[PDB]
Amino acid sequence: EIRVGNRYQADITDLLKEGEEDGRDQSRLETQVWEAHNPLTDKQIDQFLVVARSV
Amino acid sequence: EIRVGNRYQADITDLLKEGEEDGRDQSRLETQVWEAHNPLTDKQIDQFLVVARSV
């Protein structure tokens, strides 16, 4: 059975004004581990992986 | 015994004039295999050698 009431539904978060800002610190939420747009080519990454393996 | 004569001594090569040039093609005489003034440091070369070994 699906229920209705304050103790079931979520309070809907109001859309921010064009002047209002969400106030969310992105470093507290994530930390990047691989950028997808690199100066490197597939070959070079592949090559590096071989090297990382050899070491 | 040490000998004297045309068949023993070398013909002495005359000193070149300030205008004269020796005319010697250096590529026919040598080909370089390691420059001693590199943008690299001992550490990096050492490191590369380890890598060359691992591969």
Q: Whole-angstrom distance between the N-terminal and C-terminal Cα of chain A?
A: 60
- C-alpha B46/C-alpha B40 separation (Å) is 10
Cα distance between residue B22 and residue B29, in whole Å: 14
Q: Which residues of A6-29 are buried (b: 16+ CB within 10 A; e: fewer)?
A: eeeeeeeeeeeeeeeeeeeeeeee
Angle at B36 between CA B35 and CA B37, to 5 degrees: 95
User: B47 to chain A nearest CA, in Å?
Assistant: 11
Interface of A with B (CB under 8 A): 50-51, 54-55
Q: This structure's resolution (angstroms)?
A: 19.4
Nearest C-alpha in B relative to A51: B55
Q: For residues B15 and A4, what is the distance between their CA atoms, to the nearest angstrom? A: 110
DSSP B1-46: ----STTTSPPPPPPPPSS------GGGT------SS-SS-HHHHH
What is the spatial distance between Cα A19 and Cα B9, in angstroms, rounded to a whole number? 100
Task: Quote the CA–CA distance of B53 and B42 in Å, as a whole number.
Answer: 16
